[PDB]
């Protein structure tokens, strides 16, 4: 509208500190939901190994579990090297 724009003019003239404060806070609450790289923050936190990775007893039918760390199977960190 134009009533809305006039109001934004009056505060920007009288209370620039508060206008900046509400603008910065608004970005803080909105941008994370819109950012495409937010998903990588979760992935990186899950790629950090704080605990020993306890091995599994090989019953004989876990095709997707590697037998050696350098085998192809298992989660890769290729995306992280490029990121």
């Amino acid at each position: 509208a134009e009533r809305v724009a006039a109001f934004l003019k009056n505060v920007w003239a009288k209370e620039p500190v508060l206008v900046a404060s509400f603008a910065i806070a608004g970005l803080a609450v909105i941008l994370p939901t819109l950012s495409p790289y937010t998903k990588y923050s979760l992935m990186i936190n899950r790629a950090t190994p704080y605990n020993y990775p306890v091995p599994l007893r090989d019953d004989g039918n876990m095709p997707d579990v590697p037998s050696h760390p350098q085998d192809p199977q298992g989660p890769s960190l290729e995306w992280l090297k490029r990121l």
């Binding site: 950090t48 190994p49 992280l80």
Partner: protein, 96 residues
Amino acid sequence: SMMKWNRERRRLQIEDFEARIALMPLLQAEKDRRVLQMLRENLEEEATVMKDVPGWKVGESVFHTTRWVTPMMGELYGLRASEEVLSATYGFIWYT
């Protein structure tokens, strides 16, 4: 600039954490032998010291269960010099 550098630091952290993981089996194997030796040594001195105490069973457990229980500091260093005990107990907390 902060984003790129913090991404690289996260990659460096994973490298450091994976070096630890590679070494944990060796460190675990040593720790187990060290703990078991100290307990065996305490037991030998218990047999000597408590030889004439009436009713004493040497090496008796205080738990009903026969499951392995991690010893507490007193059980491991109970009969030892104060310097080693002090280092084992407060050395990490007091290091700078």
